Design a protein around this ligand. Structure first.
Ligand SMILES: Nc1ncnc2c1nc(Sc1cc3c(cc1I)OCO3)n2C[C@@H]1CCCN(Cc2cccc(S(=O)(=O)F)c2)C1
Ligand SMILES: [K+]
Ligand code: NA
Length: 208
């Protein structure tokens, strides 16, 4: 059973801006998603200090980058804290409205799209390179869900029947036809070295 939701108008506007603005420095999407993974790994690690059973769903704290040229997908996998259904349907859009407003204001004031992460909404930079984004996520307090959006003002949420993850988040980028450079080992290595060299978790770039 698939549920379809409308984005808040401000988030739909942000997604249209990211899709429509001419901006060549698209590679920053990967820094933003890796940063989000690192933050989610920090969260589960710190929570585990007070409740060690929170790692019963998996002790390993890592980030995997998985290109697939057959499917034309780049997947950013982490074993961080994950997201609840309530996050996916309500909490994320509610909290992000203020960051989105501040970001779009900053852009009019001359700021650059690369500053998007300072406003808490760097996830949406995925749409610089992806025509569709699928997020598979598992939080200790909830079931495994699949969120998906091709923009256009709506997203879907369903329970995920795929391979159980234990805990964490997979961001699956269905790349635009002209953005397949982000499936190349040499290109991903270059971007991780440039923007993500000090992330405090192992980043494994899978190869094909
Ligand atoms: N790998 C990851 N693992 C776990 N959780 C993650 C995450 N990746 C993201 S980002 C993501 C993923 C989405 C999505 C929207 C967004 I955004 O829809 C579909 O998938 N999250 C959510 C973040 C976590 C940090 C808090 N944050 C909300 C917030 C709190 C306080 C202030 C502000 S704010 O005032 O600064 F706007 C924002 C949402
Ligand atoms: K992939
Ligand atoms: Na900060």
């Amino acid at each position: 059973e698939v549920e379809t939701f409308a984005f808040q108008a401000e988030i739909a506007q942000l997604m249209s801006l990211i899709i429509n603005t001419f901006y060549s420095n698209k590679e920053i999407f990967l820094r933003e998603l890796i940063s989000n993974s690192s933050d989610a790994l920090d969260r589960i690690r710190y929570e585990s200090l007070t409740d060690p059973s929170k790692l019963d769903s998996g002790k390993e704290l890592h980030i995997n980058l998985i290109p697939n040229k057959q499917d034309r997908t780049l997947t950013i996998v982490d074993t961080g804290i994950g997201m609840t259904k309530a996050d996916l349907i309500n909490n994320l859009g509610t909290i992000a409205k203020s960051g989105t407003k501040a970001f779009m204001e900053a852009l009019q004031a001359g700021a650059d799209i690369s500053m998007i992460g300072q406003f808490g909404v760097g996830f949406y930079s995925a749409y610089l390179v992806a025509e569709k984004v699928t997020v598979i996520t598992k939080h200790n307090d909830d079931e495994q869900y699949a969120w998906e959006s091709s923009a256009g003002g709506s997203f879907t949420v369903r329970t995920d029947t795929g391979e159980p993850m234990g805990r964490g988040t997979k961001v699956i980028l269905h790349l635009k036809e002209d953005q397949t450079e982000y499936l190349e080992e040499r290109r991903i290595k270059e971007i991780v070295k440039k923007h993500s060299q000090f992330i405090g978790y192992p980043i494994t770039l899978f190869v094909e």
